[PDB]
Every structure is written in C-alpha cells, then in structure tokens.
Amino acid sequence: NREEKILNREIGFAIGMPVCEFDMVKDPEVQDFRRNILNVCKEAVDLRDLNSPHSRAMYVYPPNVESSPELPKHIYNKLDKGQIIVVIWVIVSPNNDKQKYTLKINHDCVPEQVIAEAIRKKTRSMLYQGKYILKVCGCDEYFLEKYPLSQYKYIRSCIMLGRMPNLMLMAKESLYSQLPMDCFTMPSYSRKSLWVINSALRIKILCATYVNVNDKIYVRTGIYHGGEPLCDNVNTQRVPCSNPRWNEWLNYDIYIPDLPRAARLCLSICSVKEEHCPLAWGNINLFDYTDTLVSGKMALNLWPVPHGLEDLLNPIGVTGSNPNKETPCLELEFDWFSSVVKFPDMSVIEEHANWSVSREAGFSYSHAGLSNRLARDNELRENDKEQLKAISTRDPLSEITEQEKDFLWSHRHYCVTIPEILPKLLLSVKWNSRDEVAQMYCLVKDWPPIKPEQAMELLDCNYPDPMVRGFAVRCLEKYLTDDKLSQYLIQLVQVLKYEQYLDNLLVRFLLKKALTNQRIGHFFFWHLKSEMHNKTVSQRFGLLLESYCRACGMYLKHLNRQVEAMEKLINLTDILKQEKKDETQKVQMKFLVEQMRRPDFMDALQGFLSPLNPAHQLGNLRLEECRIMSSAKRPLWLNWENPDIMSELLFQNNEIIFKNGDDLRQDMLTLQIIRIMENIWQNQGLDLRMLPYGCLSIGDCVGLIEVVRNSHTIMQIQCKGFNSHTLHQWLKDKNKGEIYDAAIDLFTRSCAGYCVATFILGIGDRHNSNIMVKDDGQLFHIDFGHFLDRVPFVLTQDFLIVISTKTREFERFQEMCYKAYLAIRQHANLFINLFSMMLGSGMPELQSFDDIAYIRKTLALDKTEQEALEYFMKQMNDA
C-alpha cells in the first residue's frame, strides 16, 4: 500500500539495509520468526491502545522511578523533618513568563498531590482540577504515575545532591496534543518418530571446498550441550592440504534418544605441523527450530577463528552457516531414519519422567551393583542437609566436583527447598541421559521462582536447555522492574547470542518490554543496531530490529534522525583523521564550518534526541563551542543548545564527545558496573558518590561520551596554578566558607568509591590525566582502557592532604573503603554473572572464564569475611 511502502523505507534506514532483502531469504525459520513474532507486537500496541491517551503517554514518557519506594537512612535524614522543598514553575500569558511557586511537602507525595499544593499556592498568590501533569525543567521526563515523589530518580538525586527540584506544571491536553494517531498494520509476508530410534549417533564428513594453499588437515568434531561435551570428541583422518575429501563416518558415544534438546555438533577444520591449529569453525543444532532431528546431506560455511581461541573447537560460538559463501565449506551427512524424527512433546517426556522415577525406585532395591546417583528417602542427615546449603552459597566460578554432582543429584527432591541451588543442580545433571533430563524437566516445571539477579545466571553460555532458560525468562517476567531491566539491558541483549533459535521466550520478553517502554526501546534499538556490523548477529539482530521498528510507532522517525546524525559524524571524522589529519585545528574547524553550510549536514547534526539520553533534545549546533580534539583518533567535542523552554534550570548547553576509532564496549561495561556498585553502597546506607557518565557504542569502534560539566583533570589543577599541594587550595578556592566542609566530605566519599571499584575490577593505570575533579569536590575517573588483565588508584600525598595520615578523617576514610569492599564481596555472584553474559561479546579483555576469575581473587571468595578484610587491608598499605 501507500503507508506500507513509507514504513519499509523508514525501517530500512533504521536497520541500515532494505526490508526486501529479508524476504529474499529462503530459511523457513527467518520467515517463521518474521510472522510468529507479530503477536508480541500486537500485545504491546494493544496495551498502549488500552487506556489511550494516558497509556500512550506512559509508553512514550515512562515514569523514571527507582525500584523501591523505601529510602535508605542517610537519604531520609537529608529531608527537613521528612519533608522536601520543591519548586513548581508556570509558563504564563502570551509573553511565556516563567513564574515559580515554592513548596515544602512530604517526600512521599504523589504527583497529583504535589500539583494540588501548587494550585493552592497559585490561588493564594493574590489574597482548577487535576487536568495537569509535572515535567522536569530542561528535559522530557514526566511524572505521569502515582509514585511517591521521592521514588522518581530526579527527586531522589536532588535529595542526595542537596539540590532543590525544579518541576514545570503543564496541561495534560498540551502533552496529548504531541502524541500522534499511530496504527499497527499486518505486513504482506504474513499472508514422525520420537525415542523409537534404537541407534548410536554417527555423522559423515563428506568433503571440504574453498580450502586450498598457504602439512596435513582434518575435521575435529564434538557433541556439546553448552560448552560441555556430551561424549569424547571424534576427529577425521589427516589429509593433504588442497585435496579435502574424507567420506568418513564418525561414531560418537551417544545413543540418539539420549541426545538433550539443546545438543550441538561443534566442528572445526584443523591444520597439523605437533602444532594443531584451527583454520575455520562452525556449530550446528542437532534439532531444528521445529524440534525435527537433522537428517541427510548438509553444507556448512565456516567462520574465521575468533582472535584468542582456547582449544581446536568453539562450542560457545554462534550456530549455523556463515552468510559469506566464499568461505571453507564443509559438506556433511546425517542418518535418515524411518521418517522425520521429532523430539517428543512435553506430555511424552512427562510420562517417561514418571516411568523413570518408577524404574529408578525398583532398580535398586533390586540392583546388586552400586549407584551414587539413585534418590534415597529418609536417608538425608542434618549434617549433609547443612553441607548442601554450603554448596548453594558458593560463587558461580567455584568448581563443583563429580562427587558433589552425584551428591546434589541424589538430593534433587530436597534441592527444591533451597531454590537458589538450581544452577548447581542443573550442572549436576547427566545431560546425555534422557532418563535424568526428563526428571529434571518436571523439577524445573514446578521450581520455586528465584530473584532476577539469580535468574540471569541461567541465561549465560552454561545453560542452553530451553526449559532452564524458559524458567529464567519466567522469573524475569514476574519479578524484574523496568529500572532493573534497563540496568542489565546490555547483558540481556548479549545472551540473545546463546539462543539456539530466532524465536525464544527471552526475545519475546525483551521485545514486549521494548515496545511498552520507550526508554527501554531506545537502548534496545541502540544495543542491537551497534552490532549490525558483526555478521555472526546481523540476521538475528536485523530481524529483531525489523519487528521492533514495525511496531515502535512515531519513535522510528526519532531513531532515523539519530541514525542520520551519527552517519554524518562518522563521515566527518573519517575525512579529518584520513585527509585533513596533520592540518591545523583552524583549517579542520573551517572544514566543519564549511560542511555545516550544507543543507543535508545542518539538518542531520541538529534537532534530534541524544542517543545517550533520549530525554535530551539537541537543538542548534553551537560550532563556536565545538572543537576537534588533540587525541590520535581526532574525536569531536560537540556542543548543542538545550531547546527546552526551561533549559537554564538544568543545563543551557549539552556537550557530547563523539569518538571514532576505539572500542567503547569496555568503558560501557565499567561504567555500568560503577552504577551498580554505587547503587549497592547507597542501598546498604553507605554514601560513596560515583559518576557513571554516559558512554554508548553505536557501531564498530564508534560511540558517544557524556561530558561532565565543571570538571578538570588532576593534571590541569596541578599545571595551571612538579607540584604536590595545589589541589586542596583549588578546592578551598572553589568552595570557600561553610561550603568547604561539604566539598572535603564529597571528595573523600567519592575518592573512597573509586579506590575500591578500581582495585576490584583491576582497571587500567590511573594517573593525573586519567582522574577528574568537579567544582564541588566530586572526584571521578575516566577512560577505563582495560579491566582485570594491584591497586591502580594510588592515593598520593596530593589526595591525602585533601582528606584533612594519622588524622581522624583518614580513620573515617579507611572505614569507608572497608565497609564498601565488604558491600561488594556480599554481591560478588551478581558481578561474576554480569561478566559471564558478556563472553559472547567479542571483547579481548573478557574472552574466557579465566578472565572473570580475577574478581574471585581481588574479592577473596575462597577466604572468610575477616580474612578477605585482612586481604584488602594488606593490599591497601602497599603503595
């Protein structure tokens, strides 16, 4: 139609490839995902059309609230008798006069209540009903829901900062006048035997093509469930280099009905010299998306080995053929049985599980042989019930012995009483034994829900089973707040890579939330779009992006304006670091200024939302405040006017650093971990102010960085002014009076926060230029080069003098680092889980579980609470 043709050009621009291309794809799964996902779209749109227009407003401007309405002790204490002084603004008459009405009201007042007092003060300022809404002055953040005022992140941040909230009052009708009439349309594309196989698995390696020049070669194979072999790996015969025809059947120690649902064939072409090397790799799901077992002739196009691969295989790697067909192509053959073999229905598995529990009970009783895996009733002693608990308290990095596994499995029915043990019991299963797997399925089917922070662990590369991942999704669906879903969004987008198929419970969950919360949808779009360059995820992420863009609504027009901006800056910074690299900042700036005269450039680089915070409107480009930086990759310091009616009450200008050349993924993760550490310390009552500024990767070593206003590096404070006493005097000068005592306190609390953080994460070398200080004393670190692969933030005499060595303030400071280290140690399981989910991300500083182990060392998990306290105590004295 007319609208369908306009939509597809808009979707195409957003993804970076035309939609017609997805149709010219003959994979039934691709076309099934495309059609079968459409109900997740339908449900999301329906929820937005439910309480229209209010429900459409909640979509476009979701309330930005904290997870709990409860405030910590140190936060509540800042309120003058549990009450907050709030400032409500009104835009009066035709001359748009800003008029403030100050209040002092209960921090837990709902926005409809706050409005009432503001109308009461307006009616009294001389001596209406609820057709109004509250907005943050200077940004598009609204207060459309009945939450305690202190629950909104702006209000809580204000309390924390000792800043007075500035909110603007406006008509509900004036906001709804900005929400357009969106319509969802149905696209043009929308309109056996089971365990009866009494046989062992064999796979024929026929031949290899596109394998030529540059001693011998072979095909290394293995059958895997996650990253664990379901039997021993089987190699083909060694063969001369250019001639690769094996025509060999490989015979595996697995009986076909014993194959788990998420069983994979993991293969690689290896070179020999004593020194075996993988040339290419590829993995195949033994069952297709429809539960059908792979049969017959097949050809798999192979992938290049990832930089820094362990063994000769890549089990954690992507499944399916490499799209580039000019690559090593391996031709295989699978046994064809009586008909089309299909994995049994849940009911057949349910009956076999009941049969297995029965045969298990009458097995021994009447066996004669010994079994450490048979379940025994009444034989569970209180000293071993307390030993089972000690297992559940173990970190995800800790090794679980074969004895502990047999122990855990014989107690599989008790385990249901310690629900947080499940990841360990799931590892304890003999995943190559249909008998135990059918039984495990029924346990999960009725397993007590676990916390989302625990659920997430069952979504890394170790838990491939659809039932295990389905239960994890179910725990998130019911217990994960939007605040928290937003906080862990980069790991949830990352673990999508561990999914066997396009259509799954996780993608369905993530997409429903994306299409019912625009703040989630923004970052869901950007985290997906930023990996379109990566061919390993291009199709899955592209299809996910198509389904998103097809139902997001008018936000696509906003996303496309953002895409056009980043594309211009990439083009711009390409020319500077290529051609005009050694040219002066005046000539380089003359080129930018000449390019800004161009219409396509002055439309693109102005009047669009900030990808770091879509609540921020980037108006006119103030070139006069922009500069090409001195850094090697020629990054841009960019300055935009804040076109908000009340910009002045937040920030009149918005500064973003656009960088093209370096990987921002490692900074993205370090800044996320900081936000988390900060939120852990804050929840535990100890106020250690951190600054996880915005950093977003938009592609292949391209991204944006939030500039922190009123900040200078440690070097800049030393330089303009060898010198070791300048910092304190500068902070005394920038905070003279009673204002000084607050600044010294904000420097120590922030200085303590970064001391712990950097130590734990093993962050890159911290110097005078890698550290920064705000006008109020707030200390923060920047450019986190590389983590894990020592105390990097060495407290020099410079920082020590600002603290007040044998002082009362330094005795308070040490007590700040100590509680903080204990606070992170009590949460090490979460941090371990966040890094594990990122293994799939191609990050060099995080390629194996060995890398994550660094935080088991620095957080002394194998030691005790007092022992680890002694570890941090000892490591902090060595400077």
User: For residue 6, what are the contacts with CB-CB under 8 A and spacing of at least 6?
Assistant: none
| Beta carbon of residue 687, minimum distance to ligand ML9 (angstroms, whole number) | 22
User: Please, which residues bridge with residue 653 across strands?
Assistant: 641
- Least distance to ligand ML9, CB of residue 754, Å: 14
Minimum CB distance to ligand ML9, residue 139 (Å): 18
Q: What is the dihedral of CA 676, 681, 683, 684, to 10 degrees?
A: 140
Stretch that binds ligand ML9, among 56-64, 606-614, 638-646, 701-709 (CB under 6 A): 701-709
Q: How many CB atoms lie within 10 A of CB 74?
A: 12
Using the minimum distance from each CB to ligand ML9, give the nearer residue, 513 or 659.
659
Q: Which is nearer to ligand ML9, 31 or 713 (CB)?
A: 713
Q: Which of 732, 783, 842, 844 is in the footprint of ligand ML9 by CB under 6 A?
A: 783
Residue closer to ligand ML9 by CB (options 366, 630) is 630
Tokens 């027009």 identify what position?
A: 557
CB-nearer residue toward ligand ML9: 129 or 630: 630
DSSP state of 345: P
**Shortest approach of ligand ML9 to residue 651 CB, angstroms?**
13
Stretch that binds ligand ML9, among 105-113, 417-425, 704-712, 839-847 (CB under 6 A): 704-712
Of the candidate spans 119-127, 170-178, 656-664, 858-866, the one that interacts with ligand ML9 by CB under 6 A turns out to be 656-664
Q: How far is the CB of 634 from ligand ML9 (least distance, A)?
A: 12
Amino acid at 214: N
705 contributes a contact to ligand ML9 by CB under 6 A: yes
Which single residue is written with the structure tokens 């067909």? 325
Residue 272 CA from chain centroid, whole number: 40
Letter for the amino acid at 555? Y
Q: Which stretch binds ligand ML9 (CB under 6 A): 142-150, 244-252, 363-371, 659-667?
A: 659-667
Alpha carbon dihedral 3, 6, 10, 16, in 10-degree steps, equals 130
Q: What CA–CA distance (Å, rounded) separates 392 from 422? A: 8
712 token code pair: 């200078």
Q: Which of 713, 726, 768, 875 binds ligand ML9 (CB under 6 A)?
A: 713
For position 405 contacting ligand ML9 by CB under 6 A, the verdict is no
Among 30, 708, 800, 869, binds ligand ML9 (CB under 6 A): 708
Q: Rounded to whole angstroms, how far apart are CA atoms 506 and 522? A: 18
Q: Which of 89, 407, 693, 821 binds ligand ML9 (CB under 6 A)?
A: 693
Q: How far is the CB of 301 from ligand ML9 (least distance, A)?
A: 35
Residue with tokens 């949460």: 827
Residue 162 C-beta: closest distance to ligand ML9, Å: 21
Backbone interruptions in the chain following residues (C to N > 2.5 Å) = 127, 191, 214, 273, 721, 789, 804
**Is there binding between residue 132 and ligand ML9 (CB under 6 A)?**
no
Between 322 and 610, whose beta carbon lies closer to ligand ML9?
610
- The answer to the question of residue 653 lying near ligand ML9 (CB under 6 A) is no
Which of 468, 417, 699, 554 minimizes the C-alpha distance to 57? 554
| Residue 769 beta carbon to ligand ML9: minimum distance, rounded to whole angstroms | 7
Work out which of 540, 659, 728, 766 binds ligand ML9, going by CB under 6 A. 659
Q: How far is residue 576's CA from residue 62's CA, in Å, rounded to a whole number? A: 40
Neighbours of 193 (CB within 10 A): 13
Taking the complex as a whole, the smallest distance from the CB of residue 606 to ligand ML9 amounts, in Å, to 22
d(CA 775, CA 742): 12
- Which backbone phi and psi does 444 adopt, to 5 degrees? -65, -45
Output the CA angle 22-26-30, nearest 5 degrees. Answer: 55
Closest CA to 451 of 419, 486, 428, 491: 419
| DSSP letter assigned to residue 233 | -
Near ligand ML9 in 745-774, by CB under 6 A: 772
- Smaller CB separation from ligand ML9, 344 or 635: 635
Q: Which string of x and - marks every residue 616-645 that binds ligand ML9 (by CB under 6 A)?
A: --------------x---------------
Nearer to ligand ML9, 143 or 693 (CB): 693
Determine the distance from the C-alpha atom of residue 639 to the mean position of all C-alpha atoms in its chain, rounded to a whole number: 28
Nearest-approach distance from CB 694 to ligand ML9, in angstroms: 8
Applying the rule CB under 6 A, the residues between 661 and 680 that interact with ligand ML9 are 664, 667
Q: Is 657 in the site for ligand ML9 (CB under 6 A)?
A: yes
Q: Cβ of residue 153: shortest distance to ligand ML9, in angstroms?
A: 19
534 binds ligand ML9 (CB under 6 A): no
CA-nearest of 637, 640, 634 to 622 is 640
Judged by CB under 6 A, which stretch of 11-19, 209-217, 708-716, 789-797 contacts ligand ML9? 708-716
Size of interface with ligand ML9, in residues (CB under 6 A): 15
Would you call 67 exposed, middle or buried from its count of C-beta atoms within 10 A (0-12, 13-18, 19+)?
A: middle
- Tell me the C-alpha distance between 470 and 426, whole Å: 14
> CB 657 → ligand ML9: shortest distance, Å?
5
Is the Cβ of residue 575 or residue 707 nearer to ligand ML9 in the bound state?
A: 707
782 touches ligand ML9 (CB under 6 A): yes
Lateral strand order in the sheet of 627-628 = 627-628, 636-641, 653-660, 702-706, 695-699
- Nearest C-alpha neighbor of 755 from the set 801, 724, 790: 790
Binders of ligand ML9 among residues 486 to 525 (CB under 6 A) are none
Q: Which is nearer to ligand ML9, 266 or 704 (CB)?
A: 704
Nearest to 114 by CA among 151, 69, 73, 74: 151
How far is the C-alpha of 601 from the C-alpha of 595, rounded, in Å? 7
Under the binding rule (CB under 6 A), the answer on residue 707 touching ligand ML9 is yes
In the complex, the residues that contact ligand ML9 under the rule CB under 6 A are 630, 657, 659, 664, 667, 693, 705-708, 711, 713, 772, 782-783
